[PDB]
Design a protein around this ligand. Structure first.
Ligand SMILES: Cc1ccncc1NC(=O)CCc1cccc(F)c1
Ligand SMILES: Cc1ccncc1NC(=O)CCc1cccc(F)c1
Lengths: 304, 304
């Protein structure tokens, strides 16, 4: 019992972190096999940041300008190439600590762990969600670029995020491991609109099921609703519209608790319309949306 | 910018996790140098749990009854001994992945990371506080016993907690790495009173400083207070009385923000007396007490 915002164990990813320096800029890189991946803005200087011409900036760089260090180990760079917003630095040595891995592009509303790093050294690990507007609300300071987000399925690390930028609003933006930004963002020091965000409804429902499994049940009521009725409330409260695909992924939790998904929707409807009345659910005084239905099942069953 | 409930990177601790089986029971052990540490209740069976005579139960066990496996590796047990509520199994091989480490007994109100494990395999990592009543509000299921809590200072892992028990209330109890329980708890399946808990005042103040550093400032007011006045409010709201030692540890945050500790106390006083009025601070709708002043400084400066 108990329910926590749990991150994946970070060891497999710690073994992949390196420091990359190009000129005056230092950030983090991810060393997998014989390639080091890092944000392409490592090649920028102060006057470059407003609208860098990355192709021209990279043309002035040679393999020997990319200093890659894995703590004590200096890596020899034998090739470089830019793919979207990432640089791929080919090195002459495969990382002996490369775990089984995949590169995946996650969907908005999915969760992942971030290993925050500075100068190639891990600082901490936390779990977060990719917002519906493709931003993440992380904890990143200058030097954290190149830190990655990931999920682990038994022995395989699926890398889904590389950190690139902090928007003027204090929220974070980055790319998949092929260097494609999540959302409309570009790697320029320019104010950039993040879309209207919404609350991840299916995750709030999954977390209400986690709450019932762990004994917090005060919010359960005598009511039910329909997808149509619930979605009128979701509209009012800026929640994602619930679909049958969301109801289907909540199937295991509904089966375990015996609480029909639409009955849980009626509890969520009452909580949206009335608030928590000074009470808490799993130690939170707000409706939590950073646990997916898979996260709830994994945590509630003890998956390793 | 951004502020998250961040755990330490767990890699150094993942390398120490092993599975220990004695008879029918399997739990986790911590392999450091040539010793494996685990909860002594691994030697219990179902009818033993209400009041086990650990000395007698252990006398029926030999080195070869303790099956220790580090995934693929089977460890050869060459000695066993009980120290308080832990067993120390001497093995013939020093763990090649033993990090620099210390065993420390943490104080109530301090924080640490937990690497939840099942069958010697890491499942996830989360940050939590040792409550003032010596319980922890973790996320542990059957099989998680032997999972450890720790902090890391550069390359040194200070182990402070080993998980032993879930109280009937769903809160958790365990020991330091010498097997001494935190709090009044005993390793028996008996209902056991956990003391009256309180909110960790110095941590709430540290988190309000983290909030100001990250832009959440709506709670700052035109008021000040005294330690005496504040402690009357702390008494009413079940918060730990604030002392000059707490004010002193908040010195760096007060210096960084320019907000005198007693002025922050006046903001905390107003929040206790009036609530949050439907607003949030660092994404929380309640007053958070699981970040120490050191945690805030580390997160806000990018320590690795
Ligand atoms: C300061 C900080 C804090 C947290 N996360 C990230 C950051 N850093 C940034 O946003 C870097 C922005 C950037 C864009 C384009 C070119 C360039 F050289 C740099
Ligand atoms: C079931 C569970 C869930 C979470 N954390 C921990 C647990 N397990 C326990 O409390 C074990 C209690 C115990 C005490 C004394 C002897 C004995 F054989 C076992």
């Amino acid at each position: 019992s108990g329910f926590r915002k749990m991150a994946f164990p970070s060891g497999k990813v710690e073994g992949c972190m390196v420091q990359v320096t190009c000129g005056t800029t230092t950030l983090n890189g991810l060393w997998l096999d014989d390639v080091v991946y890092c944000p392409r803005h490592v090649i920028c200087t102060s006057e470059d940041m407003l609208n860098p011409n990355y192709e021209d900036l990279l043309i002035r760089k040679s393999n020997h300008n990319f200093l890659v260090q894995a703590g004590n180990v200096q890596l020899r760079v034998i090739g470089h190439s830019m793919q979207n917003c990432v640089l791929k630095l080919k090195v002459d040595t495969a990382n002996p600590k490369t775990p089984k891995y995949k590169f995946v592009r996650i969907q908005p509303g999915q969760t992942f762990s971030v290993l925050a790093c500075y100068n190639g050294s891990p600082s901490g690990v936390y779990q977060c969600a990719m917002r519906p507007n493709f931003t993440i609300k992380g904890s990143f300071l200058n030097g954290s670029c190149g830190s990655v987000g990931f999920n682990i399925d038994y022995d395989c690390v699926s890398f889904c995020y590389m950190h690139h930028m902090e928007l003027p609003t204090g929220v974070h933006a980055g790319t998949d491991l092929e260097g494609n930004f999540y959302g409309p963002f570009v790697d320029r020091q320019t104010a950039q609109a993040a879309g209207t965000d919404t609350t991840i409804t299916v995750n709030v429902l999954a977390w209400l099921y986690a709450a019932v499994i762990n004994g917090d049940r005060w919010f359960l009521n005598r009511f039910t609703t329909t997808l149509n009725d619930f979605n009128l409330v979701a509209m009012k409260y800026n929640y994602e519209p619930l679909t049958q695909d969301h109801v289907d992924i909540l199937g295991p939790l509904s089966a375990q608790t015996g609480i029909a998904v639409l009955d849980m929707c009626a509890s969520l409807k009452e909580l949206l319309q009335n608030g928590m009345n000074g009470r808490t659910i799993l130690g939170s005084a707000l409706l939590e949306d950073e646990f997916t239905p898979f996260d709830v099942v994994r945590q509630c069953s003890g998956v390793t």
